[PDB]
Amino acid sequence: GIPTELKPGTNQFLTTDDGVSAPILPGFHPTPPIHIPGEVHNLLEICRVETILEVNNLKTNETTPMQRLCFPVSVQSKTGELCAAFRADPGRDGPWQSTILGQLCRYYTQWSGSLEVTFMFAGSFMATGKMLIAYTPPGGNVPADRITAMLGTHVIWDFGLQSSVTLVVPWISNTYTTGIITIWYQTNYVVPIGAPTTAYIVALAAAQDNFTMKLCKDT
């Protein structure tokens, strides 16, 4: 026989080794596969679909949880005031626990990429107005007035013409870095006779084409 040698590292059961083992049924033929539509080759095809955020997660909506998806605009509200605000971290708790992006980021440790947040108006056809979608860059301060939030990066959204506008967060990372988004009343809510006074907005959120993550970790 040839001379061999046993290095240290023998008889150890490492749990993460790609080692080929002896099969239990050598003569068996498994059933050959067929074509079934909808094959998932990578988990980043699931992280690119628009799912519903939970912005209205107050303390009173825990009893009736169907109201937590829509947050209201109204006619009795004045102009130039605040409607809603939330942070922009998919990892931690808050609104982003309820999406599919914030449920696959609990299975990892580090992530980096760009997002996109899509809004959608669900009010009557005869009503119109304007809204301001302001995005504070990370590390800055939350604006106190619309005229300070206008100087940053923002999108003017009138729902008399479009029903959906998309805002793109440029970059997030995790190894505080928060991308605070505020919704400002540009003009008040105008409405004719017969149409209802209140409306509701729903928010959608998914990742862009440069959102990767690594270091698999169990929740």
């Binding site: 083992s21 079934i36 909808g38 998932v40 107050l58 605000a85 808050g94 939350v142 990767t212």
Partner: protein, 209 residues
């Protein structure tokens, strides 16, 4: 800038974890049938998809109740789907030639068995809507393991062992929303409908960022 190989479908399901723990005090035989949905982990992770197709790879770490090892000989019998199970310690099914076995001592590196894809269909499925013939249950049935100490007398050594399991060559189809409610049983997707825990945790005011 890095590559996208940490989120491939194969690397999501590697790194073999514990699926069972089996005692055997001073009967004398155990029957552990193969199931994935026995733990809260890996049930929530395999129910992300609908149709999966994979083989397995087992490893039987075996010792005493406190660490130590003794020179004992053991037998692990694998029963294929559709064969009668061993009923007694000295039944005829222990010597049936077509149920494969392994013979391994306790003072040995642990055994390693690889089981191929055993289904008569083209893939497994965790969700069956219809009826078999009474409950809404499928017909996969991966197998059954049986463990005993060889010999015709009761061995004076209580044995505990644990079964680790890897998953190789994974393919998946038709993704699904992830389960957010606690589990009650191991066959049906029941929940506790008297109270629904909300998905997110709450805050005081909508503008309190």
């Amino acid at each position: 800038h890095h590559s996208t190989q940490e989120t491939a479908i194969g690397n999501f399901f590697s790194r073999a974890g514990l699926v069972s723990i089996i005692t055997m005090p001073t009967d004398g035989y155990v029957n552990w049938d193969i199931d994935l949905m026995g733990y809260a982990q890996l049930r929530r992770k395999c129910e992300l998809f609908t149709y999966m197709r994979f083989d397995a790879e087992f490893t039987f770490v075996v010792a005493k109740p406190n660490g130590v090892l003794v020179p004992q000989l053991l037998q692990y019998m694998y029963v294929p789907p559709g064969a009668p199970k061993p009923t007694s310690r000295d039944s005829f099914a222990w010597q049936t030639a077509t149920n494969p076995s392994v013979f391994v001592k306790m003072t040995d590196p642990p055994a390693q068995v690889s089981v191929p894809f055993m289904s008569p269909a083209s893939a497994y499925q965790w969700f069956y809507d219809g009826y078999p013939t009474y409950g809404q249950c499928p017909n996969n049935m991966m197998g059954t393991f049986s463990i005993r100490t060889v010999g015709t007398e009761k061995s004076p050594h209580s044995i505990t062992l644990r079964v680790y399991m890897r998953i190789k060559h994974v393919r998946a189809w038709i993704p699904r929303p992830l389960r957010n409610q606690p589990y009650l049983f191991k066959t049906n997707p029941n929940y506790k409908g008297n109270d629904i825990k909300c998905t997110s945790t709450s805050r005081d005011k909508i503008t309190t960022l």
